[PDB]
Amino acid sequence: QFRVVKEPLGFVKVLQWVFAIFAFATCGSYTGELRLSVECANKTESALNIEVEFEYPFRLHQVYFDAPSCVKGGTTKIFLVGDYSSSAEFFVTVAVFAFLYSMGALATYIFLQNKYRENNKGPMMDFLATAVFAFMWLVSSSAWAKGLSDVKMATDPENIIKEMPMCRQTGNTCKELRDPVTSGLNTSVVFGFLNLVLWVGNLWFVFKETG
Amino acid sequence: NNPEYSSFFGVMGASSAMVFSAMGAAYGTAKSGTGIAAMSVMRPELIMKSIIPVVMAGIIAIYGLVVAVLIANSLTDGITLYRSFLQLGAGLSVGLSGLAAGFAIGIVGDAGVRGTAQQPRLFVGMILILIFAEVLGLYGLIVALILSTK
Amino acid sequence: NNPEYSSFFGVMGASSAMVFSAMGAAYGTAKSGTGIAAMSVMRPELIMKSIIPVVMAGIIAIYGLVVAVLIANSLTDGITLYRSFLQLGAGLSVGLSGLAAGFAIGIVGDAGVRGTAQQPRLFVGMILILIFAEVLGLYGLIVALILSTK
Amino acid sequence: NNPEYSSFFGVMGASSAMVFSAMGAAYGTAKSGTGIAAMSVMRPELIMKSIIPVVMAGIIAIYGLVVAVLIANSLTDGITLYRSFLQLGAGLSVGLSGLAAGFAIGIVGDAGVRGTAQQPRLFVGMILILIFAEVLGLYGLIVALILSTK
Amino acid sequence: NNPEYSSFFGVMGASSAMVFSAMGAAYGTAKSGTGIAAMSVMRPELIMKSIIPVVMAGIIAIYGLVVAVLIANSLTDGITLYRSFLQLGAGLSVGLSGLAAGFAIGIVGDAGVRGTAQQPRLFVGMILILIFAEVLGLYGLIVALILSTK
Amino acid sequence: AILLIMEGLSAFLHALRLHWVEFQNKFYTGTGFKFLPFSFEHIRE
Amino acid sequence: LCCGPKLAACGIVLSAWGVIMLIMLGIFFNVHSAVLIEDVPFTEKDFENGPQNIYNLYEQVSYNCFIAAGLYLLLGGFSFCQVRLN
Amino acid sequence: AHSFALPVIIFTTFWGLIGIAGPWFVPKGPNRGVIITMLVATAVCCYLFWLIAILAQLNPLFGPQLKNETIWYVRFLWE
Amino acid sequence: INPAPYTVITFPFLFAVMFGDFGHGILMTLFAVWMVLRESRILSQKHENEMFSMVFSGRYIILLMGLFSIYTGLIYNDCFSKSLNIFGSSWSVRPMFTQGNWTEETLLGSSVLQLNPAIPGVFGGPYPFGIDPIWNIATNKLTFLNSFKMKMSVILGIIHMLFGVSLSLFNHIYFKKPLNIYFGFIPEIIFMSSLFGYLVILIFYKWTAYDAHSSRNAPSLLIHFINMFLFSYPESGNAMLYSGQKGIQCFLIVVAMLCVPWMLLFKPLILRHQYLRKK
Structure with a gap:
C-alpha cells in the first residue's frame, strides 16, 4: 500500500539503496593515467613521453612500465610498489553483498508486507542483520580510508623517481609531467561515509520501529 | 655428444615390456581355462562369472602393448643419451610386473574357482583378490609411465 | 653411410621371428592334435568343432610369416643398423608372443576338448578362452608390425 | 661434462626396487588366495576377516612405489654420480627385503589359515604374527630413504 | 681426483646388511608362524607366550638397521677407497649372521612349539636354546661394530 | 574406485593396527570375560 | 519403468559433482587467470613480447568450462528424467 | 613477509x-x-600438530627453486 | 580403564594425518552424511551386502574420521594435488633478485633453472595459512616435505606412545598395586622420557637456533644421536649443538643403563624376601 511508501522506512531504504549502488558502481571501475619523462646526457636516448595506466583494484605491485636505462640505448623494467587490492576488494564485495541485501529488504517491504508484519519476526532479524552490516561497513570504511591514504602516499612522483637507480646518476633529471588524479577516490570514500551515517540513522529508526 | 645407437636400448625395452606381459598373460590363461574346463559341468551357472579373471589377463596384455607403442612413438636414433635407457628400464619394469600379475591371477583363479564351485557366495572375496592383482599392475604402469615421459 | 655388413641384426630377426613362431604353433598343434585323437574314439560328432585350436596355432605361424617376410622385404645391403635393430626386436617379440600363445592354446585346448567330451554345452565358452589366446597373439603381431614400419 | 651413461644408476635402481616389490606382493596374494579358498568353504563368517592379509599384500607395492617415484623425481639429466649409487643401493635393498617379507606374509597367511579352521579366536594371534612381518618392509623403506637422502 | 665410482661399495654394503638381515628375520618368522599356528590350534594357552621367538626375530631385524645406520654415517661421496670395502664386508657379515640366527631360531622354535604339544615343561629349555641364537646374532654384531669403528 | 576405497582402507587398517599394538599393548591387559546379558530382546531375532 | 533409479543414481551423483568442480575450475581459470601455482600447463611456444596473449589464452581455456558445465547439467536433467520413470 | x-x-x-x-x-x-x-x-593434540607445522617453516635453511618459465610468469602475476 | 574415550578421538586424527587430503575427505564425509540421512530407512531395510553392514554399523567412525581428514587436507594445502592460492608467497621479486648481483640469466634459462641461494635479506618468514603453495611447483620440494613430514611423524608417534603408556599408572593405583610401580612403571617413564624427549628438545632447539646463514658447519640431529648411542665422541671436526652437551649425553646414557637393573631382579628379590618371611 502507498502508506508504506510514504512511511520514512521505505523512503530511507530506497535512498540508501541509490547512494550505495552509485557508490560502488563508481568505485569498481575507476581508471586514470599518470605521465612522466626521463632525460640523460645523451638526448638521443631521452624518452619524453612515458605513460603509465592504473586501474582498480589498484594493484600497484602489478602495474608497470619499462623506462629507458640510459646506458648504451638499453631499457629496464620499473615496477610500482603497494598492495591495495585487499582492502579494495573487501570494500566492493562488501558493498555488492550489502546491495543484494538492500534489494532483498526493499522486496520484503514491497511484496512481502504481510510476512513482514507477521508476528514481528522479520523486523528483528532484519535489524540484527543491519547492525552487523553497519559494524562491518565501519570496518571496511576505515580500511578503505587508510588504504587510499597509502595510495596517495604511493602516488608521489619523487618516490618512483628515487627508486629507479639511474635517476641517482649524473645528468638524469626525471620530471613528472602529469600527476595522477585522486578526486574520484575522495568522492567515493565520501559516499561510503554518507552510506555509513545514513545506515546508522536507519538503524536507530528501525530500532524504534521494532517497538 | 650423444653415444650413437642408444635407440637399441629402447628397442629392447619395448620388446621386453611386451615379452614379460605376454608370458604372464599366457600363464594366467592356461590355469584359468583348465580350471573352468573341468567344473563347468557341475556349476554351469558360473560360466558367465568365470570371464572376470581372463579379461584381467587381457588387461595385462593391453598394458604390455600400450608401453610398447609408447616407446615406439618415443623411439629415435636422435636421443640425448638420457631417454632411451629410460625406455629400457620402464619396459623391464612393466613387463615383469605383468608377469607377476599373471602368476598371481592364474593361481588365485584356480583356488577361487573351486571355492565358488563349492559355495556360490565366495565369489565376492575372489573378485576382491582379482581387484588387488590389477592394483599391482596399475602401480607398475604408474612408475613405468613416469619414467617413460621423463 | 651404411657401415660394414649392417644387415646382420635383421638377418637374424627374420629367423627369430619365424622360428619362435615355429615353437608356439608346433606346441599348439601338438597338444590339441593329441587330445582330439584321444577324444575321437568315444564320440566323433564333435571332432571338427574340437579341431579349432589347431588351425589357430597355424594362424600363430602365419603371424610369424608376415613379420618374417616383412623383414626379408626390407632386407638389403644398405642397412642403417637402425632398422636392423628394429627388425631384430620385432622378430623376437612376435616369436615369443606366439610361444606364449601356443602354450596357452595347447593346454587350454586339451582341457577344453576333454571337458566338452564330457558335456556338449561348454564348447562356445571354450572357444571364448581360445579367442582370448589369439588376442594375445595379435598384440604380439602388432608390436612387431610397429617395429617393422619404424 | 659428466660421465656418459650416468642417469641409469638411477633408472635401473628405480626399476629394480619396484621389480622386487612386484614379486613379493604377488607371492603374498598367491598364498593368501589359496588360503582363503581353503578357509571359506567351511568358515564363511571368517571371509572378510581373512581378507585382512590381502590388504597387506599391497603395502609391499606401496613401499616400492614410494621409493621408485622418489628415485624417478630425483633423477636428472646429469648426476653427481654419488646419489645414483645410493639409488641403486636403496632400490635393491628395499626391494629384496620386501620380497623376503612377502614370502613370510604369504606363508604365515597359510599358517593362520590352517589355524582358524577350528578356533576363530586365533584371529588375533594371526594378525599379531602378521604385524611382525611387514615391519621388515618398513625397515627396508627406512634405510632405503636414508640412502636416497644421504 | 678420486675415482668416479667411490660409493658403490659403501651403498652396496648397507644394502647387503639390511637385506640379508631381512631374509633371516623373514625365515625365522616363517617357521615361528607355522609352528605357533599349529600349537595354538591344539590348545589356546601358549599362543601369547610363544611370541618370544618372534621377538628374537625382531631382534634380528634391529641388527641390520644398527649396522646400516653405521654405514650411512661413515658413508660420503669421495670415500677414501679403503673404507667402502670394510662397509661391504661388515654388511655381508652381519646380514648373513642374521640369516644364521634366522633359520636356527625358526627351525628350533618350530620344533619346540610342536614338542610342547603334550609337554608343557619343554617350553623353558627351548627358550634357553633360542636365547643361544641371539648370542650368535650378537657374536656377528660384535664383528659389525669393530668394522664400524674403522 | 581407487583412492577413496583401496588407499582409504589401507590407511584405516593401518591405524587400527597402530592402536591394536602400539597403543593397546602398553596398558590394556587383554584378559577378560565379556558379559553376556539375558533379555527377551532376541524375540525380534 | 525404463532406466530405473537403481542405475541412474550414479549418473546423478557424477553430474552434480562434475558441475560443481568445473564451475570452480572455470572460476579459477578466468578470475585468477589460471595462476601457474594452480595450473602450470599452457599452450604457447613464443611469449617473449609480453604477458597479454597469455592472459588471452587464460580466458580462452576458461571458456572451455562453459560447454562442460552446461551439458553436464543436460545429462543431470536427463538422469532425473530417467529416475522419475517409475 | x-x-x-x-x-x-x-x-x-x-x-x-x-x-x-x-x-x-x-x-x-x-x-x-x-x-x-x-x-x-582434540584441543591439546590438535593445537600441538599445528604448532609443529607452523614452526617447521620458521627460519628456512634453503630457498625453493622455480623453473625459468614459472619465474617469468610470477614476475608479472604478483609482487 | 575403558580405552573407548581415547581411541574415539586419536584414531580419527591418525587416519586423518595418514590421509592428509582435502577433497577426498570431503567426498568421504558426503557419503557418510548420505548414509546418516537415510538411517531410519535402512534400519527397516533388508540386504545381503555384509561389507555394507559392517560400514553402516560403524558410520559413527567414518563421519568424524572424514571431518578430520578434511581438516588435515586443509593443513597440507593438498586438495586434489593442488594448493589454494592465498597469495601470501613472500620469496621473490624482480628488483630484489636483480639487486643480488644478477640479471637476464633467463635468456640462458631456456635450458637451465638456476636455483636461488637463500638469505636474500628481505624474504622468508612464516606462512600462517599452512604450507606455502610455492613448494607445489618446485621440483626440489621433495627434500622440504620429506624432512618436514618425517620429523612431524616421528614426534607425533613419540607423543602418542608417551601419553598412552601412562594408563598403566591408573591401573596400578586403582588395584592398589604399587608393586608394579616400584620395580616397574618408574624406570619405564625414566628411559622413555630421556630417550625420546631428548630428541624432541633437540629438534625444537635446532629449529629455533640455527638459520641458513650458519648452514656451513651445521650438524645434523642424526649424527648427534648416533654419536651418543655409539659411545663414540670425536675430539674435533664436529661442533656441538650446544656447549657442554657431552656431559648431559653421557649422563643420559648411564641413566638409561641404570633403569634396566630395576626391572630385572629387585622384584623377584623382594618377593622372595617376603616369601621367606612367611616361612
Whole structure:
C-alpha cells in the first residue's frame, strides 16, 4: 500500500539503496593515467613521453612500465610498489553483498508486507542483520580510508623517481609531467561515509520501529 | 655428444615390456581355462562369472602393448643419451610386473574357482583378490609411465 | 653411410621371428592334435568343432610369416643398423608372443576338448578362452608390425 | 661434462626396487588366495576377516612405489654420480627385503589359515604374527630413504 | 681426483646388511608362524607366550638397521677407497649372521612349539636354546661394530 | 574406485593396527570375560 | 519403468559433482587467470613480447568450462528424467 | 613477509580458550565425561600438530627453486 | 580403564594425518552424511551386502574420521594435488633478485633453472595459512616435505606412545598395586622420557637456533644421536649443538643403563624376601 511508501522506512531504504549502488558502481571501475619523462646526457636516448595506466583494484605491485636505462640505448623494467587490492576488494564485495541485501529488504517491504508484519519476526532479524552490516561497513570504511591514504602516499612522483637507480646518476633529471588524479577516490570514500551515517540513522529508526 | 645407437636400448625395452606381459598373460590363461574346463559341468551357472579373471589377463596384455607403442612413438636414433635407457628400464619394469600379475591371477583363479564351485557366495572375496592383482599392475604402469615421459 | 655388413641384426630377426613362431604353433598343434585323437574314439560328432585350436596355432605361424617376410622385404645391403635393430626386436617379440600363445592354446585346448567330451554345452565358452589366446597373439603381431614400419 | 651413461644408476635402481616389490606382493596374494579358498568353504563368517592379509599384500607395492617415484623425481639429466649409487643401493635393498617379507606374509597367511579352521579366536594371534612381518618392509623403506637422502 | 665410482661399495654394503638381515628375520618368522599356528590350534594357552621367538626375530631385524645406520654415517661421496670395502664386508657379515640366527631360531622354535604339544615343561629349555641364537646374532654384531669403528 | 576405497582402507587398517599394538599393548591387559546379558530382546531375532 | 533409479543414481551423483568442480575450475581459470601455482600447463611456444596473449589464452581455456558445465547439467536433467520413470 | 608473533598468539588464545572453556559450560548429562575428554584431547593434540607445522617453516635453511618459465610468469602475476 | 574415550578421538586424527587430503575427505564425509540421512530407512531395510553392514554399523567412525581428514587436507594445502592460492608467497621479486648481483640469466634459462641461494635479506618468514603453495611447483620440494613430514611423524608417534603408556599408572593405583610401580612403571617413564624427549628438545632447539646463514658447519640431529648411542665422541671436526652437551649425553646414557637393573631382579628379590618371611 502507498502508506508504506510514504512511511520514512521505505523512503530511507530506497535512498540508501541509490547512494550505495552509485557508490560502488563508481568505485569498481575507476581508471586514470599518470605521465612522466626521463632525460640523460645523451638526448638521443631521452624518452619524453612515458605513460603509465592504473586501474582498480589498484594493484600497484602489478602495474608497470619499462623506462629507458640510459646506458648504451638499453631499457629496464620499473615496477610500482603497494598492495591495495585487499582492502579494495573487501570494500566492493562488501558493498555488492550489502546491495543484494538492500534489494532483498526493499522486496520484503514491497511484496512481502504481510510476512513482514507477521508476528514481528522479520523486523528483528532484519535489524540484527543491519547492525552487523553497519559494524562491518565501519570496518571496511576505515580500511578503505587508510588504504587510499597509502595510495596517495604511493602516488608521489619523487618516490618512483628515487627508486629507479639511474635517476641517482649524473645528468638524469626525471620530471613528472602529469600527476595522477585522486578526486574520484575522495568522492567515493565520501559516499561510503554518507552510506555509513545514513545506515546508522536507519538503524536507530528501525530500532524504534521494532517497538 | 650423444653415444650413437642408444635407440637399441629402447628397442629392447619395448620388446621386453611386451615379452614379460605376454608370458604372464599366457600363464594366467592356461590355469584359468583348465580350471573352468573341468567344473563347468557341475556349476554351469558360473560360466558367465568365470570371464572376470581372463579379461584381467587381457588387461595385462593391453598394458604390455600400450608401453610398447609408447616407446615406439618415443623411439629415435636422435636421443640425448638420457631417454632411451629410460625406455629400457620402464619396459623391464612393466613387463615383469605383468608377469607377476599373471602368476598371481592364474593361481588365485584356480583356488577361487573351486571355492565358488563349492559355495556360490565366495565369489565376492575372489573378485576382491582379482581387484588387488590389477592394483599391482596399475602401480607398475604408474612408475613405468613416469619414467617413460621423463 | 651404411657401415660394414649392417644387415646382420635383421638377418637374424627374420629367423627369430619365424622360428619362435615355429615353437608356439608346433606346441599348439601338438597338444590339441593329441587330445582330439584321444577324444575321437568315444564320440566323433564333435571332432571338427574340437579341431579349432589347431588351425589357430597355424594362424600363430602365419603371424610369424608376415613379420618374417616383412623383414626379408626390407632386407638389403644398405642397412642403417637402425632398422636392423628394429627388425631384430620385432622378430623376437612376435616369436615369443606366439610361444606364449601356443602354450596357452595347447593346454587350454586339451582341457577344453576333454571337458566338452564330457558335456556338449561348454564348447562356445571354450572357444571364448581360445579367442582370448589369439588376442594375445595379435598384440604380439602388432608390436612387431610397429617395429617393422619404424 | 659428466660421465656418459650416468642417469641409469638411477633408472635401473628405480626399476629394480619396484621389480622386487612386484614379486613379493604377488607371492603374498598367491598364498593368501589359496588360503582363503581353503578357509571359506567351511568358515564363511571368517571371509572378510581373512581378507585382512590381502590388504597387506599391497603395502609391499606401496613401499616400492614410494621409493621408485622418489628415485624417478630425483633423477636428472646429469648426476653427481654419488646419489645414483645410493639409488641403486636403496632400490635393491628395499626391494629384496620386501620380497623376503612377502614370502613370510604369504606363508604365515597359510599358517593362520590352517589355524582358524577350528578356533576363530586365533584371529588375533594371526594378525599379531602378521604385524611382525611387514615391519621388515618398513625397515627396508627406512634405510632405503636414508640412502636416497644421504 | 678420486675415482668416479667411490660409493658403490659403501651403498652396496648397507644394502647387503639390511637385506640379508631381512631374509633371516623373514625365515625365522616363517617357521615361528607355522609352528605357533599349529600349537595354538591344539590348545589356546601358549599362543601369547610363544611370541618370544618372534621377538628374537625382531631382534634380528634391529641388527641390520644398527649396522646400516653405521654405514650411512661413515658413508660420503669421495670415500677414501679403503673404507667402502670394510662397509661391504661388515654388511655381508652381519646380514648373513642374521640369516644364521634366522633359520636356527625358526627351525628350533618350530620344533619346540610342536614338542610342547603334550609337554608343557619343554617350553623353558627351548627358550634357553633360542636365547643361544641371539648370542650368535650378537657374536656377528660384535664383528659389525669393530668394522664400524674403522 | 581407487583412492577413496583401496588407499582409504589401507590407511584405516593401518591405524587400527597402530592402536591394536602400539597403543593397546602398553596398558590394556587383554584378559577378560565379556558379559553376556539375558533379555527377551532376541524375540525380534 | 525404463532406466530405473537403481542405475541412474550414479549418473546423478557424477553430474552434480562434475558441475560443481568445473564451475570452480572455470572460476579459477578466468578470475585468477589460471595462476601457474594452480595450473602450470599452457599452450604457447613464443611469449617473449609480453604477458597479454597469455592472459588471452587464460580466458580462452576458461571458456572451455562453459560447454562442460552446461551439458553436464543436460545429462543431470536427463538422469532425473530417467529416475522419475517409475 | 609476515610477523611471526601474531599467528602464534591468536592460535594460542583461540585453542586455549576452547580447551579451557568447553568443559565448564557443557550440561550435566549421561555423556558429560566422554564429551569433555574428546574436546580436551582434540584441543591439546590438535593445537600441538599445528604448532609443529607452523614452526617447521620458521627460519628456512634453503630457498625453493622455480623453473625459468614459472619465474617469468610470477614476475608479472604478483609482487 | 575403558580405552573407548581415547581411541574415539586419536584414531580419527591418525587416519586423518595418514590421509592428509582435502577433497577426498570431503567426498568421504558426503557419503557418510548420505548414509546418516537415510538411517531410519535402512534400519527397516533388508540386504545381503555384509561389507555394507559392517560400514553402516560403524558410520559413527567414518563421519568424524572424514571431518578430520578434511581438516588435515586443509593443513597440507593438498586438495586434489593442488594448493589454494592465498597469495601470501613472500620469496621473490624482480628488483630484489636483480639487486643480488644478477640479471637476464633467463635468456640462458631456456635450458637451465638456476636455483636461488637463500638469505636474500628481505624474504622468508612464516606462512600462517599452512604450507606455502610455492613448494607445489618446485621440483626440489621433495627434500622440504620429506624432512618436514618425517620429523612431524616421528614426534607425533613419540607423543602418542608417551601419553598412552601412562594408563598403566591408573591401573596400578586403582588395584592398589604399587608393586608394579616400584620395580616397574618408574624406570619405564625414566628411559622413555630421556630417550625420546631428548630428541624432541633437540629438534625444537635446532629449529629455533640455527638459520641458513650458519648452514656451513651445521650438524645434523642424526649424527648427534648416533654419536651418543655409539659411545663414540670425536675430539674435533664436529661442533656441538650446544656447549657442554657431552656431559648431559653421557649422563643420559648411564641413566638409561641404570633403569634396566630395576626391572630385572629387585622384584623377584623382594618377593622372595617376603616369601621367606612367611616361612
